[PDB]
């Protein structure tokens, strides 16, 4: 596990080519997240 960039707590990876892709984020300490909801699901085949 790497370190946060100096002076930062996380990285924001922001897609700059796909205009419809939302952002993705990295943290470098497990204490920076809490697994609050557990969602059980199926993907659905298009009609």
């Amino acid at each position: 596990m790497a370190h946060s960039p100096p002076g930062h707590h996380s990285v924001t990876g922001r897609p700059s080519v796909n205009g419809l892709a939302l952002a993705e984020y990295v943290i470098y300490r497990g204490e920076q997240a809490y697994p609050e909801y557990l969602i059980t699901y199926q993907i659905m085949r298009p009609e």
Partner: protein, 161 residues
């Protein structure tokens, strides 16, 4: 230490979480290779995860980061798909849940798009699909994602290709 409380489909909390899941599905550039082909989900269950030890760790660190960033945790609710979801809900996030090969460094990755995290539920690139059918686009088997409370603090902005 962890207990799981089922939410009712009539409960507003369930509805807001489902809405966050359903509305943040997008198409992927792999045409569904990694996570399957779908425009939406059948939500089977939403459970609230309750662990006092793990919550207090989170808020202890959240306060820490707040103070290093003009009193601003920059707290978000984000998705995470992992084959290790069972371990995460009982023992917390740690180094073994890290994406060593990830493109923004060896850390724990989250997404605003539920469909992005769905690509990791059976492993990196979807691994070999569901365990019963070896099908990355399985419509039968039950998947699980985490919708997580995440402290970003001061977040290094990296534009990506």
């Amino acid at each position: 230490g962890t207990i799981l409380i089922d939410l009712s489909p009539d409960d507003k909390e369930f509805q807001s979480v489902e809405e966050e899941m359903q509305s943040t599905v997008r198409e992927h550039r792999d045409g569904g290779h990694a996570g399957g082909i779908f425009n939406r989900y059948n939500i089977l269950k939403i459970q609230k995860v309750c662990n006092k030890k793990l919550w207090e760790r989170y808020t202890h660190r959240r306060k820490e980061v707040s103070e290093e960033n003009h009193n601003h945790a920059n707290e978000r609710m984000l998705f995470h798909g992992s084959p290790f979801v069972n371990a995460i809900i009982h023992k917390g996030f740690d180094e073994r849940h890290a994406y060593i090969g990830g493109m923004f460094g060896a850390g724990i990755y989250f997404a605003e798009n539920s469909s992005k995290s769905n690509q990791y539920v059976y492993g990196i690139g979807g691994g070999t699909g569901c365990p019963v059918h070896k099908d990355r686009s399985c419509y039968i088997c039950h998947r699980q994602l985490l919708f997580c409370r995440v402290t970003l603090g001061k977040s290094f902005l990296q534009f990506s290709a």
